[PDB]
Write a protein that binds this ligand. Structure first.
Ligand SMILES: Cc1cc2nc3c(=O)[nH]c(=O)nc-3n(C[C@H](O)[C@H](O)[C@H](O)COP(=O)(O)O)c2cc1C
Ligand SMILES: Cc1cc2nc3c(=O)[nH]c(=O)nc-3n(C[C@H](O)[C@H](O)[C@H](O)COP(=O)(O)O)c2cc1C
Ligand SMILES: O=C(O)c1[nH]c(=O)[nH]c(=O)c1CCc1ccccc1CO
Ligand SMILES: O=C(O)c1[nH]c(=O)[nH]c(=O)c1CCc1ccccc1CO
Lengths: 313, 313
């Protein structure tokens, strides 16, 4: 029985990795993730310049999941590029670099400089399309015209296979349109579904207060709240993008939750909130749990069940 | 110490009511809701003609909430109008009637018939804007120009105060646009936030299957999954529509969850999934739990804390 995967010209010991933003901002974090039993790691989505992010408190977690408005705190592109070029031990596992510039030109400039390092060292690009648009317009992946412009310009600039991180959608027409846009771009080889469920609001009943400071308490949701949203998006893009891989993200706390993501179509499975709460030990647990479900069901490999969710009559 | 309140020129014993669609399809259901301790009731969203809805199974519930693709099964507008005009006992509580026609013209046709009964009996209209749209477009409330058309035509045809049932939004630009559309219509006197979180997917690990038959298992989510989403939408529209009432719906299982909805801005609080699971007895429990929290806090009225959620500096 094995968890091994071979995709995007890389070998993965298992499908598990951090979700971008969790345990991946500093060299210390990346070294931690590298030392873990995860099959891969992704670095924090970066800008060309360092950012402090929003005022604290900006992340909180609860039994059913988390809320955050971090504001993209990050060490800047040069740091993550140096980590990829000079620091990361590729013998341990593959590395993804996530970018999230504030304009199309910022993203273009990053990927122009990432390309040679991608070609030499094999780092894999994940483009975060929840980057903000012009303020007062929706995030980039909720503006299909903007999304197309970004993808055309990044594809021209980078010239190598890459992937995209998508927010969740909630309407079949949006699944259709979003996937059609992505399918215009043959260099988009993987689609990670999903980013946080946007602009939720947690309120503490004792204090009668929101729990995070930015945005009057509004922030993205992760964790148990979002698993069925996540699965839907995984499966919707799995069905619509037959020439691409889908990576699952959202609501993974156990090997069972992973197994559902994989049934839905996921190749890699990313872990955000639960990793933030439990720490990197979670990867050995998730591996054991998923192998136990595979053994009970008689499955020897992930491909035996990936995308094999059954529908009713 | 009692929870009675006045809104829309009607008196309510308490802020609680069913969510449209739950326990409100048949005459039996409506008589059961009238006999309960709820402060009001809403009828199932209707079409001009009766509908069977989708094949079963089409609803399922779990510890964290529910999924449904009911397909608008209903007894037809004629039934619900007869109920409002001849059968409902207005001495017991107010009645809301929900409509969800498949085109603007169908909605206009229904509202022109309802208007005289609204004048005579005081039934209140809730217009469900999660209704289908023209080809290739998302639901009506996700197509802001369609929503504007619907509201312009219904306002002209009906001519009396009404409300609207909204899907959740996940982007601050969308909150801004939607509330701006609603604020163009002075006859829109309440906004109900939210409908189910669209097109989630629940998968059963043992069977490796989706749990509902329609739409390859995709359906709207309710219950614990959606409470922070619901609160966000309530508060966003509370802030943006100062001259309207907001009714909260989503994730209410307890008087503490009700309390959160009211702190976010809710006037009435609707109960869907938890009512479907626990039955009409839930209303006495909710009222007792809300009064208990109020007493612990020293609040004597709903108005003392409605919309008074605190932000962090
Ligand atoms: C503290 C925090 C920071 C995050 N920052 C990023 C980010 O930089 N880039 C990104 O693509 N997603 C970011 N996310 C979203 C996660 O990658 C993930 O999509 C989301 O948390 C859902 O997964 P979960 O249910 O496992 O938490 C962040 C999430 C959290 C909680
Ligand atoms: C079985 C079922 C049927 C529903 N049908 C309708 C409907 O006819 N009209 C409507 O406005 N909402 C409908 N909804 C949505 C609910 O009114 C409510 O917005 C949603 O379930 C969220 O509330 P909850 O978390 O309390 O379930 C339905 C929900 C369920 C579970
Ligand atoms: O850092 C964040 O707030 C964050 N949290 C998430 O749940 N997902 C994300 O993708 C982000 C980053 C979103 C982003 C990208 C580029 C600039 C600013 C921001 C913050 O809105
Ligand atoms: O009956 C439904 O599936 C249902 N479920 C919800 O959770 N919310 C709703 O609003 C609906 C009705 C949606 C609707 C309106 C008009 C015609 C068709 C349909 C069903 O897709």
């Amino acid at each position: 029985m094995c968890l091994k995967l071979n995709l995007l010209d890389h070998v993965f010991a298992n499908p598990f990795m951090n979700a971008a933003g969790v345990l991946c901002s500093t060299e210390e974090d990346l070294r931690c993730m590298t030392a873990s039993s995860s099959g891969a790691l992704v670095s924090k989505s970066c800008t060309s310049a360092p950012r402090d992010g929003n005022p604290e408190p900006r992340y909180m977690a609860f039994p059913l999941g988390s809320i955050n408005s971090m504001g993209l705190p990050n060490l800047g592109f040069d740091f993550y590029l140096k980590y990829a070029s000079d620091l990361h031990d590729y013998s341990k596992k593959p590395l993804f670099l996530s970018i999230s510039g504030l304009s199309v030109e910022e993203n273009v400039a990053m990927v122009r400089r990432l390309a040679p390092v991608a070609q030499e060292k094999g780092v894999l690009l994940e483009l975060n399309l929840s980057c903000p648009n012009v303020p007062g317009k929706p995030q980039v992946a909720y503006d299909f015209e903007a999304m197309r412009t970004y993808l055309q310009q990044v594809s021209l600039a980078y010239g190598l296979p890459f992937g995209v991180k998508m927010p969740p959608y909630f309407d079949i027409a949006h699944f259709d349109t979003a996937a059609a846009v992505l399918n215009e771009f043959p260099l988009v080889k993987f689609v990670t579904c999903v980013n946080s469920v946007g602009n939720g609001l947690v309120i503490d009943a004792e204090s009668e207060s929101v729990v995070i400071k930015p945005k009057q308490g509004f922030g993205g949701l992760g964790g148990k709240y979002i698993l069925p949203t996540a699965l839907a998006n995984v499966n919707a893009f799995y069905r619509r993008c037959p020439d691409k891989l889908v990576f699952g993200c959202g609501g993974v706390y156990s090997g069972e939750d992973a197994f559902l993501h994989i049934l839905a179509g996921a190749s890699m499975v990313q872990v955000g909130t639960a990793l933030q709460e439990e720490g990197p030990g979670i990867f050995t647990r998730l591996e054991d749990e998923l192998l136990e479900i595979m053994a009970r069901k008689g499955y020897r490999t992930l491909e035996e069940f990936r995308g094999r969710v059954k529908t009713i009559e």
